[PDB]
Protein backbone atom coordinates (compact mmCIF):
# COMPACT_ATOMS: atom_id res chain seq x y z
CA UNK A 1 0.00 0.00 0.00
CA UNK A 2 3.12 2.20 0.29
CA UNK A 3 4.54 4.30 -2.56
CA UNK A 4 7.78 2.28 -2.17
CA UNK A 5 6.05 -1.10 -2.40
CA UNK A 6 4.07 -0.33 -5.56
CA UNK A 7 7.25 1.01 -7.20
CA UNK A 8 9.19 -2.22 -6.61
CA UNK A 9 6.23 -4.09 -8.14
CA UNK A 10 6.61 -2.01 -11.32
CA UNK A 11 10.37 -2.58 -11.55
CA UNK A 12 9.72 -6.31 -11.74
CA UNK A 13 6.97 -6.06 -14.38
CA UNK A 14 9.48 -4.13 -16.47
CA UNK A 15 12.01 -6.99 -16.44
CA UNK A 16 10.18 -8.31 -19.52
CA UNK A 17 5.20 -7.40 -22.19
CA UNK A 18 1.63 -7.85 -23.40
CA UNK A 19 -0.05 -8.01 -19.93
CA UNK A 20 0.16 -4.80 -17.89
CA UNK A 21 1.07 -1.36 -19.39
CA UNK A 22 4.49 -1.74 -21.02
CA UNK A 23 5.32 1.84 -21.88
CA UNK A 24 8.94 1.14 -20.94
CA UNK A 25 9.24 -0.60 -24.29
CA UNK A 26 7.80 2.37 -26.20
CA UNK A 27 10.22 4.65 -24.37
CA UNK A 28 10.57 8.13 -22.85
CA UNK A 29 8.64 9.95 -25.56
CA UNK A 30 5.47 7.86 -25.01
CA UNK A 31 5.72 8.10 -21.21
CA UNK A 32 6.41 11.85 -21.44
CA UNK A 33 3.19 12.44 -23.42
CA UNK A 34 1.23 10.75 -20.60
CA UNK A 35 3.01 12.64 -17.81
CA UNK A 36 2.28 15.88 -19.57
CA UNK A 37 -1.38 15.12 -20.30
CA UNK A 38 -1.97 13.79 -16.76
CA UNK A 39 -0.47 16.95 -15.20
CA UNK A 40 -3.02 19.02 -17.15
CA UNK A 41 -5.79 16.60 -16.04
CA UNK A 42 -4.65 16.94 -12.42
CA UNK A 43 -4.91 20.73 -12.71
CA UNK A 44 -8.28 20.48 -14.43
CA UNK A 45 -9.74 18.10 -11.85
CA UNK A 46 -8.31 20.10 -8.96
CA UNK A 47 -10.07 23.21 -10.27
CA UNK A 48 -13.42 21.87 -11.58
CA UNK A 49 -14.02 18.41 -10.09
CA UNK A 50 -14.46 16.81 -6.70
CA UNK A 51 -11.78 15.53 -4.36
CA UNK A 52 -12.19 11.95 -5.50
CA UNK A 53 -11.82 12.82 -9.19
CA UNK A 54 -8.71 14.89 -8.39
CA UNK A 55 -7.24 11.98 -6.41
CA UNK A 56 -7.91 9.57 -9.32
CA UNK A 57 -6.13 11.86 -11.78
CA UNK A 58 -3.27 12.32 -9.30
CA UNK A 59 -2.84 8.55 -9.00
CA UNK A 60 -2.57 8.30 -12.81
CA UNK A 61 0.09 11.05 -12.77
CA UNK A 62 2.06 9.30 -10.03
CA UNK A 63 1.82 5.98 -11.89
CA UNK A 64 3.28 7.47 -15.08
CA UNK A 65 6.01 9.35 -13.13
CA UNK A 66 6.95 5.99 -11.57
CA UNK A 67 6.98 4.37 -15.02
CA UNK A 68 9.29 7.15 -16.24
CA UNK A 69 11.59 6.39 -13.26
CA UNK A 70 11.59 2.71 -14.24
CA UNK A 71 12.32 3.60 -17.87
CA UNK A 72 15.34 5.75 -16.98
CA UNK A 73 16.68 3.55 -14.18
CA UNK A 74 15.94 6.13 -11.46
CA UNK A 75 15.36 4.83 -7.93
CA UNK A 76 13.21 6.05 -5.05
CA UNK A 77 16.36 6.86 -3.08
CA UNK A 78 17.64 9.05 -5.93
CA UNK A 79 14.35 11.02 -5.88
CA UNK A 80 13.91 11.06 -2.12
CA UNK A 81 17.44 12.43 -1.72
CA UNK A 82 16.22 15.51 -3.62
CA UNK A 83 12.85 15.81 -1.87
CA UNK A 84 14.90 17.36 0.95
CA UNK B 1 12.48 9.64 4.36
CA UNK B 2 9.19 8.03 3.27
CA UNK B 3 6.70 9.66 0.87
CA UNK B 4 4.12 9.35 3.69
CA UNK B 5 6.34 11.08 6.26
CA UNK B 6 7.20 14.10 4.13
CA UNK B 7 3.51 14.51 3.26
CA UNK B 8 2.44 14.73 6.90
CA UNK B 9 5.18 17.35 7.38
CA UNK B 10 3.59 19.49 4.65
CA UNK B 11 0.08 19.13 6.11
CA UNK B 12 1.34 20.75 9.31
CA UNK B 13 3.17 23.61 7.59
CA UNK B 14 -0.13 24.35 5.85
CA UNK B 15 -1.99 24.85 9.16
CA UNK B 16 -0.82 28.49 8.98
CA UNK B 17 3.02 31.58 6.06
CA UNK B 18 6.15 33.53 5.17
CA UNK B 19 8.69 30.73 5.89
CA UNK B 20 8.43 27.69 3.58
CA UNK B 21 6.53 27.72 0.22
CA UNK B 22 2.93 28.66 1.01
CA UNK B 23 1.25 28.07 -2.32
CA UNK B 24 -1.80 26.74 -0.47
CA UNK B 25 -2.68 30.36 0.24
CA UNK B 26 -2.37 31.37 -3.44
CA UNK B 27 -4.58 28.46 -4.37
CA UNK B 28 -5.16 25.78 -6.98
CA UNK B 29 -4.37 27.99 -9.98
CA UNK B 30 -0.85 28.83 -8.68
CA UNK B 31 -0.13 25.22 -7.79
CA UNK B 32 -1.51 24.01 -11.12
CA UNK B 33 0.88 26.21 -13.11
CA UNK B 34 3.76 24.57 -11.20
CA UNK B 35 2.48 21.00 -11.68
CA UNK B 36 2.13 21.60 -15.40
CA UNK B 37 5.53 23.32 -15.82
CA UNK B 38 7.24 20.63 -13.76
CA UNK B 39 5.73 17.80 -15.78
CA UNK B 40 7.19 19.33 -18.92
CA UNK B 41 10.56 19.75 -17.11
CA UNK B 42 10.43 16.11 -16.05
CA UNK B 43 9.84 15.01 -19.67
CA UNK B 44 12.61 17.34 -20.92
CA UNK B 45 15.11 16.10 -18.32
CA UNK B 46 14.14 12.47 -18.96
CA UNK B 47 14.90 12.96 -22.64
CA UNK B 48 17.99 15.22 -22.67
CA UNK B 49 19.57 15.15 -19.22
CA UNK B 50 21.16 12.65 -16.88
CA UNK B 51 19.55 10.46 -14.27
CA UNK B 52 20.28 12.84 -11.40
CA UNK B 53 18.84 15.85 -13.25
CA UNK B 54 15.71 13.85 -14.02
CA UNK B 55 15.39 12.78 -10.40
CA UNK B 56 15.68 16.40 -9.23
CA UNK B 57 12.92 17.46 -11.61
CA UNK B 58 10.77 14.53 -10.55
CA UNK B 59 11.17 15.47 -6.92
CA UNK B 60 9.97 19.02 -7.70
CA UNK B 61 6.92 17.56 -9.51
CA UNK B 62 6.07 15.24 -6.58
CA UNK B 63 6.44 18.12 -4.12
CA UNK B 64 3.97 20.27 -6.05
CA UNK B 65 1.59 17.34 -6.48
CA UNK B 66 1.71 16.88 -2.67
CA UNK B 67 1.06 20.58 -2.20
CA UNK B 68 -1.99 20.28 -4.47
CA UNK B 69 -3.22 17.39 -2.33
CA UNK B 70 -2.84 19.52 0.80
CA UNK B 71 -4.63 22.42 -0.88
CA UNK B 72 -7.62 20.26 -1.82
CA UNK B 73 -7.75 18.22 1.36
CA UNK B 74 -6.80 14.97 -0.40
CA UNK B 75 -5.06 12.30 1.67
CA UNK B 76 -2.51 9.62 0.80
CA UNK B 77 -5.08 6.93 1.46
CA UNK B 78 -7.44 8.57 -1.04
CA UNK B 79 -4.73 8.50 -3.71
CA UNK B 80 -3.29 5.08 -2.78
CA UNK B 81 -6.78 3.59 -2.98
CA UNK B 82 -6.71 4.49 -6.67
CA UNK B 83 -3.12 3.41 -7.34
CA UNK B 84 -4.60 -0.11 -7.38
CA UNK C 1 -0.05 30.42 -47.15
CA UNK C 2 -1.71 32.71 -44.56
CA UNK C 3 -2.82 31.54 -41.10
CA UNK C 4 -6.34 32.68 -42.07
CA UNK C 5 -6.37 30.66 -45.31
CA UNK C 6 -5.25 27.37 -43.77
CA UNK C 7 -7.86 27.78 -41.02
CA UNK C 8 -10.74 28.12 -43.47
CA UNK C 9 -9.44 24.97 -45.22
CA UNK C 10 -9.74 23.12 -41.90
CA UNK C 11 -13.29 24.37 -41.24
CA UNK C 12 -14.40 22.74 -44.52
CA UNK C 13 -12.68 19.41 -43.85
CA UNK C 14 -14.59 19.34 -40.56
CA UNK C 15 -17.97 19.56 -42.32
CA UNK C 16 -17.85 15.75 -42.52
CA UNK C 17 -13.92 11.62 -41.93
CA UNK C 18 -11.38 8.91 -42.73
CA UNK C 19 -9.04 11.05 -44.90
CA UNK C 20 -7.27 13.89 -43.05
CA UNK C 21 -6.99 14.08 -39.21
CA UNK C 22 -10.55 14.06 -37.86
CA UNK C 23 -9.98 14.83 -34.19
CA UNK C 24 -13.11 16.99 -34.21
CA UNK C 25 -15.06 13.73 -34.11
CA UNK C 26 -13.11 12.39 -31.12
CA UNK C 27 -13.73 15.66 -29.30
CA UNK C 28 -12.10 18.20 -27.01
CA UNK C 29 -10.41 15.68 -24.71
CA UNK C 30 -8.45 14.10 -27.59
CA UNK C 31 -7.40 17.46 -29.08
CA UNK C 32 -6.51 18.76 -25.61
CA UNK C 33 -4.05 15.88 -25.12
CA UNK C 34 -2.34 16.91 -28.33
CA UNK C 35 -2.20 20.63 -27.49
CA UNK C 36 -0.71 19.88 -24.10
CA UNK C 37 1.82 17.40 -25.50
CA UNK C 38 2.89 19.66 -28.37
CA UNK C 39 3.31 22.64 -26.00
CA UNK C 40 5.88 20.60 -24.07
CA UNK C 41 7.54 19.52 -27.35
CA UNK C 42 7.74 23.15 -28.44
CA UNK C 43 9.43 24.08 -25.14
CA UNK C 44 11.76 21.11 -25.49
CA UNK C 45 12.80 21.87 -29.08
CA UNK C 46 13.17 25.56 -28.30
CA UNK C 47 15.66 24.64 -25.57
CA UNK C 48 17.64 21.72 -27.04
CA UNK C 49 17.08 21.65 -30.79
CA UNK C 50 17.74 23.78 -33.83
CA UNK C 51 15.50 26.50 -35.25
CA UNK C 52 13.98 24.24 -37.89
CA UNK C 53 13.11 21.54 -35.36
CA UNK C 54 11.48 24.17 -33.16
CA UNK C 55 9.55 25.54 -36.16
CA UNK C 56 8.21 22.06 -36.99
CA UNK C 57 6.98 21.54 -33.41
CA UNK C 58 5.43 25.01 -33.37
CA UNK C 59 3.54 24.21 -36.59
CA UNK C 60 2.12 21.06 -34.99
CA UNK C 61 1.00 23.09 -31.98
CA UNK C 62 -0.68 25.75 -34.10
CA UNK C 63 -2.40 23.07 -36.16
CA UNK C 64 -3.90 21.46 -33.05
CA UNK C 65 -4.86 24.85 -31.61
CA UNK C 66 -6.68 25.55 -34.90
CA UNK C 67 -8.40 22.15 -34.72
CA UNK C 68 -9.55 22.98 -31.17
CA UNK C 69 -10.94 26.26 -32.55
CA UNK C 70 -12.87 24.33 -35.19
CA UNK C 71 -14.11 21.82 -32.60
CA UNK C 72 -15.48 24.58 -30.38
CA UNK C 73 -16.86 26.82 -33.11
CA UNK C 74 -14.33 29.59 -32.38
CA UNK C 75 -13.39 31.90 -35.25
CA UNK C 76 -10.22 33.81 -36.09
CA UNK C 77 -12.02 37.09 -35.44
CA UNK C 78 -12.96 35.90 -31.93
CA UNK C 79 -9.31 35.10 -31.15
CA UNK C 80 -7.86 38.13 -32.98
CA UNK C 81 -10.16 40.43 -31.00
CA UNK C 82 -8.36 39.22 -27.86
CA UNK C 83 -4.83 39.37 -29.35
CA UNK C 84 -5.14 43.13 -28.77
CA UNK D 1 -5.60 42.23 -37.78
CA UNK D 2 -3.77 39.33 -39.52
CA UNK D 3 -1.56 36.80 -37.71
CA UNK D 4 1.29 37.94 -39.97
CA UNK D 5 0.88 41.60 -39.09
CA UNK D 6 0.78 41.17 -35.35
CA UNK D 7 3.90 39.00 -35.58
CA UNK D 8 5.92 41.68 -37.39
CA UNK D 9 4.80 44.13 -34.67
CA UNK D 10 6.36 41.84 -32.04
CA UNK D 11 9.62 41.46 -33.95
CA UNK D 12 10.12 45.24 -33.72
CA UNK D 13 9.26 45.48 -30.02
CA UNK D 14 11.94 42.85 -29.46
CA UNK D 15 14.64 45.03 -31.09
CA UNK D 16 15.19 46.54 -27.64
CA UNK D 17 12.40 46.74 -22.65
CA UNK D 18 10.29 47.97 -19.74
CA UNK D 19 7.09 48.76 -21.74
CA UNK D 20 5.39 45.71 -23.31
CA UNK D 21 6.11 42.08 -22.23
CA UNK D 22 9.84 41.51 -22.77
CA UNK D 23 10.13 37.67 -22.38
CA UNK D 24 12.74 37.63 -25.05
CA UNK D 25 15.17 39.03 -22.50
CA UNK D 26 14.33 36.41 -19.87
CA UNK D 27 14.77 33.67 -22.46
CA UNK D 28 13.36 30.38 -23.65
CA UNK D 29 12.84 28.92 -20.19
CA UNK D 30 10.50 31.72 -19.12
CA UNK D 31 8.57 31.67 -22.38
CA UNK D 32 8.34 27.91 -22.25
CA UNK D 33 6.68 27.98 -18.83
CA UNK D 34 4.03 30.24 -20.31
CA UNK D 35 3.50 28.12 -23.39
CA UNK D 36 3.06 25.04 -21.29
CA UNK D 37 0.75 26.66 -18.77
CA UNK D 38 -1.35 28.30 -21.49
CA UNK D 39 -1.80 25.02 -23.37
CA UNK D 40 -3.31 23.51 -20.21
CA UNK D 41 -5.50 26.56 -19.81
CA UNK D 42 -6.62 26.21 -23.44
CA UNK D 43 -7.61 22.59 -22.81
CA UNK D 44 -9.32 23.54 -19.53
CA UNK D 45 -11.38 26.38 -21.03
CA UNK D 46 -12.21 24.25 -24.08
CA UNK D 47 -13.69 21.60 -21.80
CA UNK D 48 -15.36 23.64 -19.04
CA UNK D 49 -15.89 27.22 -20.24
CA UNK D 50 -17.70 29.10 -22.96
CA UNK D 51 -16.46 29.85 -26.47
CA UNK D 52 -15.28 33.35 -25.57
CA UNK D 53 -13.24 32.19 -22.57
CA UNK D 54 -11.65 29.51 -24.77
CA UNK D 55 -10.84 32.12 -27.45
CA UNK D 56 -9.18 34.38 -24.87
CA UNK D 57 -7.00 31.51 -23.61
CA UNK D 58 -6.15 30.54 -27.18
CA UNK D 59 -5.06 34.11 -27.94
CA UNK D 60 -2.73 34.02 -24.95
CA UNK D 61 -1.23 30.74 -26.22
CA UNK D 62 -0.68 32.12 -29.70
CA UNK D 63 0.89 35.26 -28.29
CA UNK D 64 3.45 33.26 -26.34
CA UNK D 65 4.10 30.86 -29.23
CA UNK D 66 4.84 33.98 -31.33
CA UNK D 67 7.12 35.38 -28.64
CA UNK D 68 8.94 32.03 -28.65
CA UNK D 69 9.37 32.37 -32.42
CA UNK D 70 10.84 35.83 -31.93
CA UNK D 71 13.18 34.61 -29.18
CA UNK D 72 14.56 31.83 -31.40
CA UNK D 73 14.67 33.79 -34.64
CA UNK D 74 11.98 31.66 -36.28
CA UNK D 75 9.93 33.27 -39.05
CA UNK D 76 6.33 32.78 -40.18
CA UNK D 77 7.61 31.35 -43.46
CA UNK D 78 9.63 28.76 -41.54
CA UNK D 79 6.52 27.64 -39.67
CA UNK D 80 4.10 27.98 -42.60
CA UNK D 81 6.38 25.78 -44.73
CA UNK D 82 5.73 22.99 -42.19
CA UNK D 83 1.97 23.65 -41.83
CA UNK D 84 1.71 21.82 -45.18
Swiss-Prot record, chains A, B, C, D:
Gene: hisE
CDD domains linked to this entry: NTP-PPase_HisE (cd11547)
A GO molecular-function descriptor: phosphoribosyl-ATP diphosphatase activity
Main subcellular location: cytoplasm
Biological or metabolic pathway of the protein: Amino-acid biosynthesis; L-histidine biosynthesis; L-histidine from 5-phospho-alpha-D-ribose 1-diphosphate: step 2/9
Keywords: Amino-acid biosynthesis, ATP-binding, Cytoplasm, Histidine biosynthesis, Hydrolase, Nucleotide-binding
Family: Belongs to the PRA-PH family.
InterPro entries assigned: HisE, PRib-ATP_PPHydrolase-like
One Pfam family recorded for the sequence: PRA-PH
Name by which UniProt lists this protein: Phosphoribosyl-ATP pyrophosphatase
Record carries keyword Amino-acid biosynthesis: yes
UniProt signal peptide: none
EC number(s) reported in the record: 3.6.1.31
Known catalytic reactions: 1-(5-phospho-beta-D-ribosyl)-ATP + H2O = 1-(5-phospho-beta-D-ribosyl)-5'-AMP + diphosphate + H(+)
Top EC group: hydrolase
Cellular localisation: Cytoplasm
GO cellular component, one term: cytoplasm
One GO biological process term: L-histidine biosynthetic process
